Amino acid sequence: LPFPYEFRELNPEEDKLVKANLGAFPTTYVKLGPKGYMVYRPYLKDAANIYNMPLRPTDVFVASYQRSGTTMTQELVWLIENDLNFEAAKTYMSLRYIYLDGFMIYDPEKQEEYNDILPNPENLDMERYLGLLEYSSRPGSSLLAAVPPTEKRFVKTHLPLSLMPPNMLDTVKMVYLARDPRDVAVSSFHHARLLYLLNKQSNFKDFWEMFHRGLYTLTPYFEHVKEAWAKRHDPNMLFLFYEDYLKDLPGSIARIADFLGKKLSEEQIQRLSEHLNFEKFKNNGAVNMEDYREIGILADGEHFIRKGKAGCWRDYFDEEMTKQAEKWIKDNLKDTDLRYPNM
Amino acid sequence: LPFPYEFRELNPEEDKLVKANLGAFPTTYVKLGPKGYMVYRPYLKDAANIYNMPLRPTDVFVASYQRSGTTMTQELVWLIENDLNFEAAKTYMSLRYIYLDGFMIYDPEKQEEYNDILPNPENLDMERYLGLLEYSSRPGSSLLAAVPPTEKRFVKTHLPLSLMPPNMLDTVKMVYLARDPRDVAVSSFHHARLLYLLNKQSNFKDFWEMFHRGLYTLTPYFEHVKEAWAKRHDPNMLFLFYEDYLKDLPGSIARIADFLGKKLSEEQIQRLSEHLNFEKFKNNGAVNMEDYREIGILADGEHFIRKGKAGCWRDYFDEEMTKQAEKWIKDNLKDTDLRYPNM
Ligand SMILES: Nc1ncnc2c1ncn2[C@@H]1O[C@H](COP(=O)(O)O)[C@@H](OP(=O)(O)O)[C@H]1O
Ligand SMILES: Nc1ncnc2c1ncn2[C@@H]1O[C@H](COP(=O)(O)O)[C@@H](OP(=O)(O)O)[C@H]1O
Ligand SMILES: C[C@]12CC[C@@H](O)C[C@@H]1CC[C@@H]1[C@@H]2CC[C@]2(C)C(=O)CC[C@@H]12
Ligand SMILES: C[C@]12CC[C@@H](O)C[C@@H]1CC[C@@H]1[C@@H]2CC[C@]2(C)C(=O)CC[C@@H]12
Ligand SMILES: [Ca+2]
Ligand SMILES: [Ca+2]
């Protein structure tokens, strides 16, 4: 099966906005497909392979537009499939899951350019840093095909459904997370600050400008959610809202367990929910990627697991931005049954 | 005289490293003085008293950074002062010497927490175990003041000179032992394993990391040795190298005897050297503290008197560690006349 998509460069206006906020970061973008999904240029080298990647009936995918509850979901899905063996789950999440599209953010051609975004390149633990860069050079497809058949493959991706094998849900199970885009925006802003992707001179309004305009990584945001929403009633797709994890963690866990063919005891569900307690999780070395800070690539006062709250976007949007966001959500939810819990 | 030192908590980075290797052990550390000597928290309660402890012209101290030849030296110094009465030396070394700072490793506040580091707490001889804990609760100063004036006091300590009465050498005699830090590191690692101080999951590279970085008990290592080295000329200080005990035991014994005001016969020196034979000493119940194993607090395959060799650090350091250790020693020996025999 051939790759049915053409890519396109950003036009002058789009390129101006993006550069003004992300120009310092080495990697550039291109829009892919008819919906114009923003992908880091390096994604193109593995695009056809991903679209045609061989799937296995045992594969399990945790998909979502970034910062929507992926990490939490991965931990839950992993423990449940592995009979709540919390002990075995103490290994790095990055070793337990393959980040299908994680590679695209790195361009080997510009290797020398990446350390220049760091306040102090000199403090880097080079062995580990170069180690990271090498891993990031490996296309997702290869990482997946590498896993032996007698080992259950856990996949993490932020890729929209239209870029992966169509009908994939006929073979694999997927848990897709969606979150209020406004909160997603604030979390993505900080995430961007965490890894030095955003220009230090840019602020949140700038980021929000790129975001709702479909000029940030893997956006248009709504097209992304919509594809998954449409596959909501499929037996192998479990569409969940990040907000529900907060309002009723126990309840979400039951749904995930059932979706995976497991019946947990009220006690087991309780044990899992406690394990997912924000403070405890935020301090869980296996999932917070704090070891990245010892390597030297994380910014001061930023963490992968941040605040873990819903609705905090009100502390970042001014009157104008607020209305602009309302109109935007309004327009994209018009003539669809998609609705957010907290909205 | 007031205690001229302030203490300081470990900063986040330092605390992370330490905890990762010693966290399971109940007792915590703090850095003391301008040099930042690592002391177990409980040391603070008796710090001022030790700094101001009353000394006696008959007192004799055997000092050193741990695992540098203290025990051997204690036996030699004791026999020589007691007219080679080998018979009277058959009593426990712990009863013949007061371990000035031995107490700091135990915190009565966490009494319940200590037995939890044992594989089998249930096998403990409780009477003796609680007996140990009680003795360990007594500050060193008190143990010393307790000894009657008509009895010669033998003191053992791993405290640097700057923490004891300044000018102390004006009253007491001290024999200070120094050993190649690399070998000291390997011996301290095993010692740490012996008493269950180190996390069972940590390995030697981890320990060596803490060690040369000044994050282990009574380090910075070089500052410790340097203080004693500077007083090497004083008539009441005898600076010796552990390595010399191996290359020329008879020769070291003569120096110790002369330092103490005793003239031994070539035969007496010979009798002493034989008494200090590694195998024989390692099996000497009065100094190997094997009775601690019957109590139940020693780890399998670990002993106080281990290999008794010099240079064996080469079997524990990999190429990188080796260079890192070379640079480190290089830097601390720069602009000083301090030199190690085997180096
Ligand atoms: N155990 C947990 N409970 C609640 N929120 C959690 C969590 N672990 C992570 N999060 C939150 O999930 C978001 C990250 O999403 P993802 O894992 O998909 O990248 C962050 O949102 P915030 O930035 O709002 O804090 C993060 O703090
Ligand atoms: N009679 C003896 N001859 C040689 N080395 C001895 C000895 N008695 C003890 N040692 C060694 O001295 C070190 C202990 O030092 P200290 O008494 O100051 O704590 C240990 O080093 P190793 O771990 O290298 O074997 C130990 O085996
Ligand atoms: C590219 C970048 C961020 C830019 C540069 O510092 C190199 C690193 C290499 C590791 C990457 C990281 C981005 C976030 C990634 C993709 C992860 O979440 C795991 C691997 C991480
Ligand atoms: C604290 C600890 C080790 C931790 C715990 O098992 C209690 C014992 C009590 C006796 C201590 C021992 C450490 C080493 C000591 C200080 C000696 O060398 C003699 C007394 C010993
Ligand atoms: Ca560079
Ligand atoms: Ca206990």
- Secondary structure string (H, E, C) spanning chain A: CCCCCCEECCCHHHHHHHHHHHCCCCCCEEEECCCCEEEEHHHHHHHHHHHCCCCCCCCEEEEECCCCCHHHHHHHHHHHHCCCCCCHHHCCHHHHCEECCHHHHCCHHHHHHHHHHCCCHHHCCHHHHHHHHHHCCCCHHHHHHHCCCCCCCEEEECCCHHHCCCCHHHCCEEEEEECCHHHHHHHHHHHHHHCCCCCCCCCHHHHHHHHHCCCCCCCCHHHHHHHHHHCCCCCCEEEEEHHHHHHCHHHHHHHHHHHCCCCCCHHHHHHHHHHCCHHHHHCCCCCCCCHHHHHCCCCCCCCCCCCCCCCHHHHCCCHHHHHHHHHHHHHHHCCCCCCCCCC
Give the integer Cα–Cα distance in Å for A69 and A73: 6
Give the integer Cα–Cα distance in Å for B303 and B293: 9
Domains, chain B, with CATH or none: 1-343 (3.40.50.300)
Q: Say which residues have a Cβ less than 8 Å from residue B138's Cβ, sequence separation at least 6.
A: B103
Give the integer Cα–Cα distance in Å for A341 and A179: 9
What's the gap between Cα A250 and its chain centre?
A: 23
> Is the CB of A308 within 6 Å of ligand 1?
yes
Ligand 6 centroid distance, CA of B126 (Å): 12
Pocket probe for ligand 2: among B65, B70, B71, B278, the residue whose CB has the most ligand atoms within 8 Å is B71
Is residue B336 helix, strand or coil? Answer: coil
Decide: B219 and B318 in contact? Cβ < 8 Å. Answer: no
Give the integer Cα–Cα distance in Å for B333 and B340: 10
Give the integer Cα–Cα distance in Å for A213 and A198: 17
Give helix A181-194 / helix A221-230 axis angle, nearest 10°.
Answer: 120
Give the integer Cα–Cα distance in Å for B154 and A84: 58
Decide: B240 and B231 in contact? Cβ < 8 Å. Answer: no
**Strand boundaries in chain B, DSSP class E:** 7-8, 29-32, 37-40, 60-64, 98-99, 154-157, 173-178, 237-241
Give the integer Cα–Cα distance in Å for A231 and A172: 13
Smallest Cα–Cα separation from B106: which of B132, B136, B143, B140? B136
Give the integer Cα–Cα distance in Å for A140 and A46: 7
What residue numbers of B does the annotated binding site for Ca(2+) cover?
A: 112, 115-116
Give helix A319-333 / helix A181-194 axis angle, nearest 10°.
Answer: 120
Decide: B86 and B272 in contact? Cβ < 8 Å. Answer: no
Closest-lying ligand to the alpha carbon of A108? 3
Pocket probe for ligand 3: among A92, A96, A117, A136, the residue whose CB has the most ligand atoms within 8 Å is A136
> Is the CB of B105 within 6 Å of ligand 4?
yes
Decide: A286 and A91 in contact? Cβ < 8 Å. Answer: yes
Structure tokens at B88: 């009277």
Q: Which helix (H) or strand (E) holds B262?
A: none
Q: In terms of DSSP bridges, do strands A29-32 and A7-8 run parallel, antiparallel, or are they unpaired?
A: antiparallel
Residues β-bridged to residue A30: A39
Q: Say which residues have a Cβ less than 8 Å from residue A81's Cβ, sequence separation at least 6.
A: A60, A152, A154, A260, A262
- Phi, psi (degrees; rounded to nearest 5) at A241: -105, 135
> Is the CB of A278 within 6 Å of ligand 1?
yes
Is residue B301 helix, strand or coil? Answer: coil
Decide: B312 and B183 in contact? Cβ < 8 Å. Answer: yes
What's the gap between Cα A48 and its chain centre?
A: 20
Decide: A104 and A42 in contact? Cβ < 8 Å. Answer: yes
- Phi, psi (degrees; rounded to nearest 5) at A167: 70, 5
Give the integer Cα–Cα distance in Å for A31 and B75: 80
Q: What is the DSSP string of B151-192?
A: S--EEEE---GGGS-TTGGGT-EEEEEE--HHHHHHHHHHHH
Smallest Cα–Cα separation from A153: which of A103, A236, A97, A102? A97
Give the integer Cα–Cα distance in Å for A272 and B4: 52
Residues β-bridged to residue B7: B32
Structure resolution in Å? 2.3
Closest-lying ligand to the alpha carbon of A122? 5
Structure tokens at B72: 């051997």
Q: In terms of DSSP bridges, do strands B29-32 and B7-8 run parallel, antiparallel, or are they unpaired?
A: antiparallel
Structure tokens at B175: 């024999």
Decide: B252 and B268 in contact? Cβ < 8 Å. Answer: no
